[PDB]
Design an enzyme around this catalytic site. Structure first.
Site, PDB file in Angstrom:
ATOM      1  CG  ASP A  79      -0.378   0.077   2.614  1.00  0.00           C
ATOM      2  OD1 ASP A  79       0.780   0.489   2.646  1.00  0.00           O
ATOM      3  OD2 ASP A  79      -0.799  -0.432   3.317  1.00  0.00           O
ATOM      4  CB  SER A  80      -0.323   4.361   0.110  1.00  0.00           C
ATOM      5  OG  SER A  80      -1.368   5.125   0.412  1.00  0.00           O
TER       6      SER A  80
END
Ligand code: HEM
Ligand SMILES: *P(=O)(O)OCC(C)(C)[C@H](O)C(=O)NCCC(=O)NCCSC(=O)CCCCCCCCCCCCC
Ligand SMILES: CCCCCCCS[C@@H]1O[C@H](CO)[C@@H](O)[C@H](O)[C@H]1O
Ligand SMILES: [Cl-]
Lengths: 78, 380
Positions: free
Chosen positions: A38-39
């Site tokens: 994820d980010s």
């Protein structure tokens, strides 16, 4: 036994960060698509790599890397 | 280090290209805004939403995330209005004015402890203790527990900053556990025996006990970090401009306009952030849905199209429509408290220390806040 290679060191970092099993961390595997990064994971991965190989990775260069092999290639070339 | 000494040259080169600048800094890609009118417009527009400072579905730091995501600062409609309204009672103009006796009293008590020393460190001796005692009194934290609160605040503030690391977030998770557990217990106490504090106000009312706890944590953090920077940044500003320092000393009634210019010139909070909930056209560019928008409040405060000679410190500016407290629905809840703490601290300091002087100032390694490591001064 042998001292940790570039490939082994990179894969260990990825495995520890993404809680993912080895050999699931294959070359050619995508960080986001395959490994589910994820980010935050991707930011923390670069930080962990920067510390492991005592180097600074520019934001431009980090953006180019989306696969395991590409990360290994960058560290070998720098 | 070079950016920390003078970030305003860095802001200027961005503004020269475009007031809304597409770029990447510390591995975080997005739109970096240095323009005043662009900043104000974005903050006013509800299509630019607040978001969680860590990924929504992340469970790497489960407790940290849970505490963060409950706070009004990172909530949108309709949860934001509910949470803000419930907390607002302790920060109304009238309620804020009722804090003045305790603030003045605390200010004098702290100045007493250094009065004969001819030297002080403004932050640790004055700025921090004042802000800490004040917010803890408002929330309802006993003096015995206020050192724990200092520890949590300093740790948790790092968890939202660009400069954060894995070890900072791991530490943040531990502090999140401690803080949440503590406030849960304090709320149970106040539930059985209410007192004259904010926690008991929250129990009067709705609001889950975890939401009440996370609200307390938010307010504790803001009270310990930003207000301290406001006071310390202001003192340095004035001492670096003796012309207007003398002007302020000669008439303390100028403290209002002076503090506003300190807010504009060295803004305690340098950054806030939004995410685009849809495609948005602004200032000739298109921000696509999901893209991140970083608003540089310190930079917008130096916009020459609004403040004629922006890099000049001028306490007589009127009015002073700076964006240091933000803008729109999330505009600082405690701005009246912060202004009062600063006005009383600075005026009293200048009054009791008539020959105040500076003793290579270093700033804390935070990119979203402008915070001095320390500020040594001499007097009398
Ligand atoms: C003890 C004093 C303070 C308290 C209790 C406090 C509390 C808060 C709270 C609860 C919010 C969230 C409001 C919402 O989301 O609706 C907020 C927002 C904000 N605060 Fe304060 N604050 C204080 C001091 C300061 C100071 C000194 C500054 C710097 C000048 C500051 C800058 C801001 C900004 C820029 C926002 C908006 C952030 C955004 O829109 O994303 N605060 N404050
Ligand atoms: P993914 O695509 O899931 O990632 C998105 C996120 C949001 C994680 C971003 O990509 C990101 O990590 N960005 C960098 C971190 C970030 O955006 N931080 C926010 C910067 S500041 C901010 O948003 C508001 C804070 C300033 C307001 C000050 C108020 C007083 C201080 C209180 C602090 C309380 C915090 C607990
Ligand atoms: C390397 C892990 S992945 C890499 O992470 C970078 C930093 O977040 C991103 O800029 C890039 O798009 C992403 O592929
Ligand atoms: Cl001057």
């Amino acid at each position: 036994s042998h001292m940790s290679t570039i490939e082994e060191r990179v894969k260990k970092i990825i495995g520890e960060q993404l809680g993912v099993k080895q050999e699931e961390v294959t070359n050619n595997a995508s960080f986001v698509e395959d490994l589910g990064a994820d980010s935050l994971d991707t930011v923390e991965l670069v930080m962990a790599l920067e510390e492991e190989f005592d180097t600074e990775i520019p934001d431009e260069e980090a953006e180019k890397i989306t696969t395991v092999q590409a990360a290994i290639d960058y560290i070998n070339g720098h | 280090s070079e950016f920390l000494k003078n970030p305003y040259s860095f802001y200027d080169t961005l503004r020269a290209v475009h007031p809304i600048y597409k770029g990447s800094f510390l591995k975080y890609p997005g739109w970096y805004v240095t323009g005043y009118e662009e900043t104000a417009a974005i903050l006013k527009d509800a299509r630019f939403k607040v978001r969680t400072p860590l990924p929504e579905s992340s469970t790497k730091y489960q407790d940290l995330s849970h505490v963060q995501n409950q706070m009004m600062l990172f909530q949108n409609q309709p949860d934001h209005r509910r949470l803000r309204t419930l907390a607002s009672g302790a920060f109304t103009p009238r309620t804020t004015e009722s804090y003045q006796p305790y603030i003045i009293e605390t200010v004098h008590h702290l100045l007493d402890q250094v009065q004969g020393k001819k030297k002080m460190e403004v932050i640790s001796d004055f700025a921090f203790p004042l802000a800490s005692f004040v917010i803890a009194n408002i929330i309802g934290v006993p003096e015995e527990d206020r050192e724990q609160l200092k520890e949590w605040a300093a740790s948790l503030i790092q968890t939202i900053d660009f400069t954060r690391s894995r070890k900072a977030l791991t530490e943040g998770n531990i502090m999140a556990v401690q803080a949440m557990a503590y406030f849960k217990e304090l709320i149970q106490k106040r539930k059985r025996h209410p007192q004259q504090d904010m926690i008991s106000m929250l129990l009067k009312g709705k609001l889950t006990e975890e939401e009440a706890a996370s609200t307390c944590i938010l307010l504790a953090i803001a009270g310990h970090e930003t207000t301290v920077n406001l006071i310390s940044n202001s003192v340095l500003c004035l001492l670096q401009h003796p012309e207007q320092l003398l002007k302020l000393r000669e008439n303390p009634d100028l403290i209002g306009t002076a503090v506003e210019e300190c807010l504009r010139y060295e803004s305690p909070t340098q950054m806030t952030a939004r995410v685009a909930s849809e495609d948005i056209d602004i200032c000739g560019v298109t921000i696509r849905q999901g893209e991140q928008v970083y608003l540089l409040l310190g930079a917008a405060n130096r916009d020459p199209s609004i403040f004629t000679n922006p890099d000049v410190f001028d306490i007589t500016r009127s009015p002073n429509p700076h964006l240091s407290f933000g803008h729109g629905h999330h505009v600082c809840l405690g701005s009246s408290l912060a202004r009062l703490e600063a006005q009383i601290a600075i005026n009293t300091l200048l009054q009791r220390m008539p020959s105040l002087n500076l003793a290579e100032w270093r700033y804390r390694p935070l990119f979203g806040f402008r915070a001095l490591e320390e500020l040594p001064v001499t007097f009398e």
